[PDB]
Design a protein around this ligand. Structure first.
Ligand SMILES: O=C(Nc1ccc(C(F)(F)F)cc1)Nc1ccc(S(=O)(=O)N2CCC[C@H]2CN2CCOCC2)cc1
Length: 126
């Protein structure tokens, strides 16, 4: 059993831009979600070997997690805030598609997503 390589977090050819919106996504959004009691399943790429989920990467073809987002924000990977917001939305959607309603992991993702959406609604103006 094998995990895929993680999503890209370093690419010297990709143009980068530090924006006040991206700064908010790191210092407010990511740091708040990271400390949440339900953050732990989402703090690193899904380890389908360790978690005995051998079909995970057969079903989920755009994996994303907050460990990768944290690296992308701290290492200035992005050009705009929308790219980072899409990463969070992908992470949540993966969990909803792979698991079933009623699963504890889905209740955890739903709690984090409610927090995320509240914070995104207060994304500062550029
Ligand atoms: O599936 C999704 N989204 C989603 C799916 C597919 C796609 C796709 F990619 F296809 F487009 C995109 C997004 N979300 C979600 C589903 C069930 C629960 S639930 O089972 O936990 N449950 C039942 C109803 C609400 C909840 C009860 N909550 C208890 C605590 O108080 C608040 C409500 C939680 C979240």
């Amino acid at each position: 059993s094998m995990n895929p390589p993680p999503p890209e977090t370093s690419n010297p050819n990709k143009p980068k831009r530090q924006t006040n919106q991206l700064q908010y996504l790191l210092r407010v959004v990511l740091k708040t979600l990271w400390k949440h009691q339900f953050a732990w399943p989402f703090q690193q790429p899904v380890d389908a070997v360790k978690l005995n989920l051998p079909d995970y990467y057969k079903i989920i073809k755009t994996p994303m997690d907050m460990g990768t987002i944290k690296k992308r924000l701290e290492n200035n990977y992005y050009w705009n805030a929308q790219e980072c917001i899409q990463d969070f939305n992908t992470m949540f959607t993966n969990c909803y598609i792979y698991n079933k309603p009623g699963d504890d992991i889905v209740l955890m993702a739903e709690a984090l997503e409610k927090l995320f959406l509240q914070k995104i609604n207060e994304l500062p103006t550029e």
